Ligand binder design. Structure first.
Ligand SMILES: Nc1nc2c(ncn2COCCO)c(=O)[nH]1
Ligand SMILES: Nc1nc2c(ncn2COCCO)c(=O)[nH]1
Lengths: 300, 304
């Protein structure tokens, strides 16, 4: 059966992702802006940023904000979830690809990364975060995630030039999301190099130190028993996080360059990405129309 | 290789599901109980109480639809968390389909939290169909050997059974009882509809035993204007969500238990449904004891 190469462009917002992907037998599954603004709900991004500002200002409590913020992440990740679910049966075993599928973000952005960042912002409970983690779909073969690199100051500038509708320039959020994504990359290397979070959990009291991986965010008091022990439910969600992340293939793109270079660089990063066979002979056309239909309906 | 038999006892609350399952285990059979401790303490504070007070405020007109939905949605996330991790952890142990070397009786299946209760709250007006379909899109892949037991119990009998057997924080909401009895009835029909060859896409315009009418399936709840494009058809994102729903429920083995009898009757009736249920092989030699510890640890920590 033919081959497919899927590439998920992910990372903190404001780095020029969408911009450089458009610059690239190659379909682009875009940012579901229409779902966020109208289909799933009314102006979700605006809802997300207003609630944080209301929390920041003390107009509401951490509990009010958490309920709003949590409900919102479900709307944000919906498009990525159905896409993964409908595509899964078409993906075959690891293997020029017959089709290159470029995505604007992977499910973990909405089921792990942002909820994690909102936790670090005090608007999401750590239990809500691990509930999204437990729902992360199984990691299929050939899951190539391209994350971005950009010095913080150039990122602030870029973030500033292109914002989304209803968004507010939150430097604290930019810092939170940068840490999460930075931790995420370390976690993948940790896991791939043999790291056992259960074996190094004490350390929170040639691989990255567990203190530099995402597991550090969950040594949170809400998740711990009176004797300091992590409750098994929560420990079980960490075993799933570990399983889901270890098989992903991470690639880093230096966005600290001109749009032509970034675009060049991404093409360059394609050579070591993993391709897979498809399941049926009719998979490519089916995959194509899914991409174009999604694009047509949810890209704004 | 050793075999395993998993059985999920599900259905509307207040029928006597938890009692009869325990009775069943009292007879290498572990019970994975209702994780009440996660709902009352570990995941949030008195979640069942939050849910019922919220639908109540909504019903009384003290909060708005948007307020209730935001609360209901986060609360549904806490409710299903214990089901989801157990499924994810247990998944690599289940092998292909196949007495059992181990029998696992679960108190509810992940779809109770990821489909049925959300669908009912939608009917009750405290949740949006977009949110229900998002949950559905997150329903974990159905493992082979998924035997699910749903229950039957006359409404008058059901009503009287509720006016006592209330959870802590629960309120006597007969409207929600009707909605949930209705949703599980649709669930049952949806499984046979799909197993009889039904295709929701083919029968959309129409909106053991013979193949049911789509209007008697879960698909009928998603004929909501919020989900419809200007041309009358469903937005593709929502259509794809129904594709997932059909894929998840079509491989489940559903059985109906009659709860209109004494507890010992229900137990024996359930014990009979069990002899003809689908088993599976486990993947590794140590999956069985591992699985034993998991259910026991789950029970010890979350039961209440
Ligand atoms: N998924 C998700 N994306 C977010 C959130 N806050 C900001 N973003 C960025 O996505 C769009 C640009 O702001 C959030 O809470 N969740
Ligand atoms: N998951 C879930 N269970 C509920 C809900 N309402 C009632 N129950 C079940 O009754 C509470 C005791 O199980 C709800 O919204 N979600």
């Amino acid at each position: 059966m033919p081959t497919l190469l899927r590439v998920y462009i992910d990372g903190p917002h404001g780095m020029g992702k969408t911009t450089t992907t458009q610059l690239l037998d190659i379909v682009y599954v875009p940012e579901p802006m229409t779902y966020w603004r109208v289909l799933g709900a009314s102006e979700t991004i605006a809802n997300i940023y207003t609630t944080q500002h209301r929390l920041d200002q003390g107009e509401i409590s951490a509990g009010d904000a958490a309920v709003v913020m949590t409900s919102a992440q479900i709307t944000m990740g919906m498009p990525y979830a159905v896409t993964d679910a409908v595509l899964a049966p078409h993906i075959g075993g690891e293997a020029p690809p017959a089709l290159t599928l470029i995505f604007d973000r992977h499910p973990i952005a909405a089921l792990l990364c942002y909820p994690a960042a909102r936790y670090l912002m005090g608007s999401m409970t750590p239990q809500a975060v691990l509930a999204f983690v437990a729902l992360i779909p199984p990691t299929l073969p050939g899951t190539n995630i391209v994350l971005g690199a950009l010095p913080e100051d150039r990122h602030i500038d870029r973030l500033a030039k292109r914002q989304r509708p209803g968004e507010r320039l939150d430097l604290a959020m930019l810092a939170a999301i940068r840490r999460v994504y930075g931790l995420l990359a370390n976690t993948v290397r940790y896991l791939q190099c043999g790291g056992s979070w259960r074996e190094d959990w004490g350390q929170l009291s040639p691989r990255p130190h567990i203190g530099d991986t995402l597991f550090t965010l969950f040594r949170a008091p809400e998740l711990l028993a009176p004797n300091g022990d992590l409750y098994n439910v929560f420990a079980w969600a960490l075993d799933v996080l570990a399983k889901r992340l270890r098989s992903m293939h991470v690639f880093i793109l230096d966005y600290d360059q001109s749009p032509a270079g970034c675009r060049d660089a991404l093409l360059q990063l394609t050579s070591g990405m993993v391709q897979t066979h498809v399941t049926t002979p009719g998979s490519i056309p089916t995959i194509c129309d899914l991409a174009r239909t999604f694009a047509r309906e949810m890209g704004e």
